[PDB]
Curated annotation (Swiss-Prot), chain A:
Annotated Gene Ontology cellular component terms: cytosol; nucleoplasm; nucleus; proteasome accessory complex; proteasome complex; proteasome regulatory particle, base subcomplex
Subunit structure: Component of the 19S proteasome regulatory particle complex. The 26S proteasome consists of a 20S core particle (CP) and two 19S regulatory subunits (RP). The regulatory particle is made of a lid composed of 9 subunits, a base containing 6 ATPases and few additional components including PSMD4. Interacts with NUB1. Interacts with SQSTM1. Interacts with UBQLN4. Interacts with UBE3A. Interacts with UBQLN1 (via ubiquitin-like domain). Interacts with DDI2.
Protein name as catalogued: 26S proteasome non-ATPase regulatory subunit 4
Name of the gene: PSMD4
Organism whose genome encodes this protein: Homo sapiens (Human)
The keyword Signal belongs to this UniProt entry's keyword annotation: no
Presence of the UniProt keyword Nucleus in the record: no
Function: Component of the 26S proteasome, a multiprotein complex involved in the ATP-dependent degradation of ubiquitinated proteins. This complex plays a key role in the maintenance of protein homeostasis by removing misfolded or damaged proteins, which could impair cellular functions, and by removing proteins whose functions are no longer required. Therefore, the proteasome participates in numerous cellular processes, including cell cycle progression, apoptosis, or DNA damage repair.
Domain notes: The 2 UIM motifs are involved in the binding to a multi-ubiquitin chain in a cooperative way.
Cross-link annotation Glycyl lysine isopeptide (Lys-Gly) (interchain with G-Cter in SUMO2), location: 122
Full protein: residues contained: 1 to 191 of 377
Swiss-Prot record, chain B:
Family: Belongs to the AAA ATPase family.
Chain ranges passing through the membrane: none
Organismal lineage: Eukaryota, Metazoa, Chordata, Craniata, Vertebrata
Top-level lineage group: Eukaryota
Processing and modification events after translation: Sumoylated by UBE2I in response to MEKK1-mediated stimuli.
Protein name: 26S proteasome regulatory subunit 6A
Organism: Homo sapiens
Swiss-Prot record, chain C:
Complexes and interactors: Component of the 19S proteasome regulatory particle complex. The 26S proteasome consists of a 20S core particle (CP) and two 19S regulatory subunits (RP). The regulatory particle is made of a lid composed of 9 subunits including PSMD7, a base containing 6 ATPases and few additional components. Within the complex, PSMD7 interacts with subunit PSMD4 through their respective MPN domain. Interacts with TRIM5.
Family designation: Belongs to the peptidase M67A family.
Protein name: 26S proteasome non-ATPase regulatory subunit 7
Lineage of producing organism: Eukaryota, Metazoa, Chordata, Craniata, Vertebrata
Record domain MPN: where: 5-140
Swiss-Prot record, chain D:
Species of provenance: Homo sapiens
PTM sites of type N6-acetyllysine: 295
Domain PCI, chain residue ranges per copy: 168-335
Keyword list, A-Z: Acetylation, Proteasome
InterPro entries (UniProt xref): PCI_dom, PSD13_N, PSMD13, WH_DNA-bd_sf
Spans through the membrane: none
UniProt family annotation: Belongs to the proteasome subunit S11 family.
Biological processes per GO annotation: meiosis I; proteasome-mediated ubiquitin-dependent protein catabolic process; ubiquitin-dependent protein catabolic process
Coiled-coil ranges per UniProt: none
Function summary: Component of the 26S proteasome, a multiprotein complex involved in the ATP-dependent degradation of ubiquitinated proteins. This complex plays a key role in the maintenance of protein homeostasis by removing misfolded or damaged proteins, which could impair cellular functions, and by removing proteins whose functions are no longer required. Therefore, the proteasome participates in numerous cellular processes, including cell cycle progression, apoptosis, or DNA damage repair.
Subunit structure as annotated in this protein's UniProt entry: Component of the 19S proteasome regulatory particle complex. The 26S proteasome consists of a 20S core particle (CP) and two 19S regulatory subunits (RP). The regulatory particle is made of a lid composed of 9 subunits including PSMD13, a base containing 6 ATPases and few additional components.
Any GO molecular function: structural molecule activity
PROSITE patterns (alphabetical): PCI
Name the UniProt record assigns to this protein: 26S proteasome non-ATPase regulatory subunit 13
Length: 191, 31, 158, 373
């Protein structure tokens, strides 16, 4: 198993709500946290996968812990509504992921974004070159829908890394008729 | 058809909260 | 409605040796920590507290770190030694404030009827008073905006 | 149901620019920019033909969508009421949509301020106080919406038009002053609200410090194109008496609701003339004769006692008035509201206090020097 601390961010924002694929888009993100958390549970009992949010705050509710079933209870009433922000969850995931254990793992982030997120091109290039300077490989995931011609997350894939990069990838999702296990099975390959 | 889902999440919260009623009961009862 | 508290300098001396921690763990300048205690009256006593491993970004100053490994199980220890001495608030050094402080108060107002922020002093050269309290206030304005929450100068003492 | 708007697609010239798109929104099954399409139908000048049809599809949104906050549903019934012009079933339909469309939001405040917004057809004071009261019963949690505080002003101000607290329009208009801070609508309507703000706060006396927030920018920006003596007769109660043509210009020009409590306004130039005359000369002779009182405050000798005994009921100044010499004595007062020229010019008292109590402090400690011991 490859050594990283993958940081999952709940997409508890207002564009993860309707009845297009399932009658509940929370099942998509919830089962995504299920498959990555059981993936890190079966992967290594030395990781630390807790929770971080993007809506209006970065609330580390539980301990950044190798346990997950409490966070799985926190997946219930996740409140999928709020001000989505791409800038804060990665930064607090970085300084949160500098508060880690006996350094056995690198820093990975998965960022569930179901919105045309409010981020400048200057903000993604500054954050993405800070992540160049700070040795982080990020798996970038669209849920719900992002607007067509995705600018934020795709150019965040662009300027992310190098010198053992190869983490920066994006699966954009359309708001069509499908099911949510294909909406996580499509980014389960290349996050 | 969503009242069974909210009452169902409240029922898993009733199993967790009953596990904390047996942790507030049993786990405190240990000490 | 808080005039004063009783301050034991014991855990203030724990702010002294955590002030010895921050000089040797690295970049963290300010000593930030969490204040234990019990509301008895408008007058209060603080008998214990604890100092948090905390980091604070200078860019977007509202980045808190109050670990719940560090919170919950240490509250089980601090509960295990005494059921009385639970939380009452929290502290940090510097004289004025911290762009994060208000949010850091609201993380523990779920734990306390009035989580107080008592901004503390590691290097006393002051002209006024020592460490001083700030209670939960909603003074807003005569305006009718969303509710103000910045915690106002509610007198305390040693 | 798709054909329900395939038949009602074209709704005017240039109008189907959002309808050739709207026939693709529900095929995309989004509901957020469709909420913004309800808001766009508020935005586009529709005369309420499409909403009054599509409200059955809004009941369908209550059937199978069942996630969107009914903000835009309350919007769309208060824009279907253009087609209706009858609120009597829009209220039952409104609380119906309140109880049948679920949200984790504060949904009762927007619905009861929606009932208060449509309460104007009820013949008021019979149903106002109950649910209008219930909004501030439920405003205590979080006024983060604060346009429910604007609607709450509007029922609070039609509730001011339920007569009986004639300067609750002052503080209530200050709630309107920060229900939204930016005036977010043109100058003329709200500067007529600055006209009738000055009037309805003026002639109504529940407030006494009436010349207080005339400095405030969102109202004086309105007053820059108001009539040029309403501002000045508001200065007649901001300065307080000494604008005789302005404390009389309320009698020259402003006729409605005037003579009912104009003698009380002229009582307020006297009460306000007190904090004038004890502020303006700070020094002694605070046992003032009634001469400036009987002269400048347009009162006679027999009434100066009432001029203070009513002020005894006021309680800002509590003078110990001589009655062997008829001398109106000055005690502690509520002095002024703002003298920024003396917020600068307070140095001859503040720094005076600083270096004189500090310097004479060092004259004591310089005398009490070599007992340092």
């Amino acid at each position: 198993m490859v050594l990283e601390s993958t940081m999952v961010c709940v997409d508890n924002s207002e564009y993860m709500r309707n009845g297009d694929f399932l009658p509940t888009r929370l099942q998509a993100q919830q089962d995504a946290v299920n498959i990555v958390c059981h993936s890190k549970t079966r992967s290594n009992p030395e990781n630390n996968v807790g929770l971080i949010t993007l809506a209006n705050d970065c609330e580390v509710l539980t301990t950044l812990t190798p346990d997950t079933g409490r966070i799985l209870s926190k997946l219930h009433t996740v409140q999928p509504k709020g001000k989505i922000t791409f800038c804060t969850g990665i930064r607090v995931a970085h300084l949160a992921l500098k508060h880690r254990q006996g350094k056995n793992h690198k820093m990975r982030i998965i960022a569930f974004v179901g919105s045309p997120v409010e981020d400048n091109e200057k903000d993604l290039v500054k954050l993405a070159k800070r992540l160049k300077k700070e040795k982080v490989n990020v798996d970038i995931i669209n849920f719900g829908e992002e607007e067509v011609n995705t600018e934020k997350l795709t150019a965040f894939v662009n300027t992310l890394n190098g010198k053992d990069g190869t983490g920066s990838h994006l699966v954009t999702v359309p708001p069509g008729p499908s099911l949510a296990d294909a909406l996580i099975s499509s980014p389960i390959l290349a996050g | 058809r969503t009242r069974l889902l909210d009452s169902e999440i409240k029922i898993m919260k009733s199993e967790v909260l009953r596990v904390t009623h047996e942790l507030q009961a049993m786990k405190d009862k240990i000490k | 409605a808080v005039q004063k508290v009783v301050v034991h300098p014991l855990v203030l001396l724990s702010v002294v040796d955590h002030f010895n921690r921050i000089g040797k763990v690295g970049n963290q300048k300010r000593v930030v920590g969490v204040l234990l205690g019990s509301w008895q009256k408008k007058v209060l006593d603080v008998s214990n507290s604890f100092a948090v491993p905390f980091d604070e970004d200078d860019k977007d100053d509202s980045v808190w770190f109050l670990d719940h490994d560090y919170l919950e199980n240490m509250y089980g220890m601090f509960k295990k030694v005494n059921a009385r001495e639970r939380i009452v608030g929290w502290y940090h050094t510097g004289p004025k404030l911290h762009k994060n402080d208000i949010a850091i108060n609201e993380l523990m107002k779920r734990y306390c009827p009035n989580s107080v922020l008592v901004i503390i002093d590691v290097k006393p050269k002051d002209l006024g008073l020592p460490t001083e309290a700030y209670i939960s206030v909603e003074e807003v304005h005569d305006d009718g905006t969303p509710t103000s929450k910045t915690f106002e100068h509610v007198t305390s003492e040693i | 149901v798709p054909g329900f708007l395939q038949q009602s697609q074209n709704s005017g010239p240039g109008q189907p620019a959002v309808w050739h798109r709207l026939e693709e929104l529900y095929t995309k099954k989004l509901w957020h920019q469709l909420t913004l399409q309800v808001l766009d139908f508020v935005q586009d000048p529709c005369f309420a033909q499409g909403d009054g049809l599509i409200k059955l599809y809004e009941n369908f949104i209550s059937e199978f969508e069942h996630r969107v906050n009914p903000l835009s549903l309350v919007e769309i019934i208060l824009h279907v009421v253009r087609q209706m012009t009858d609120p009597n079933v829009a209220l039952t339909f409104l609380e119906k949509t309140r109880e049948k469309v679920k949200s984790s939001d504060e949904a009762v405040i927007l619905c009861k301020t929606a009932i208060g917004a449509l309460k104007l057809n009820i013949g008021d004071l019979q149903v106002t106080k109950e649910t209008i009261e219930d909004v501030e019963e439920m405003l205590n949690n979080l006024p983060g919406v604060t346009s429910v505080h604007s609607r709450f002003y509007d029922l609070s101000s039609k509730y001011y038009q339920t007569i009986g607290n004639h300067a609750s329009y002052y503080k209530d208009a200050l709630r309107f002053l920060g229900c939204v801070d930016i005036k977010d609508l043109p100058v003329s309507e709200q500067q007529e609200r600055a006209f009738t703000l000055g009037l309805a706060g003026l002639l109504g006396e529940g407030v006494f410090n009436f010349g207080e927030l005339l400095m405030h920018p969102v109202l004086e920006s309105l007053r820059n194109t108001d009539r040029q003596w309403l501002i000045d007769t508001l200065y007649a109660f901001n300065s307080g008496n000494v604008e005789r043509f302005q404390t009389l210009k309320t009698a020259w020009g402003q006729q409605p609701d005037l003579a009912a409590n104009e003698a009380q306004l002229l009582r307020k130039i006297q009460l306000l003339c007190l904090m004038e005359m004890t502020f303006t000369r700070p020094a002694n002779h605070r046992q003032l004769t009634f001469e400036e009182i009987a002269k400048s405050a347009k009162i006679t000798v027999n009434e100066v006692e009432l001029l203070v005994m009513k002020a005894l009921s006021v309680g800002l100044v509590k003078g110990s008035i001589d009655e062997v010499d008829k001398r109106v004595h000055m005690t502690w007062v509520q002095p002024r509201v703002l003298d920024l020229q003396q917020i600068k010019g307070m140095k001859d008292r503040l720094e005076f206090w600083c270096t004189d109590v500090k310097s004479m402090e060092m004259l004591v400690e310089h005398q009490a020097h070599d007992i340092l011991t």
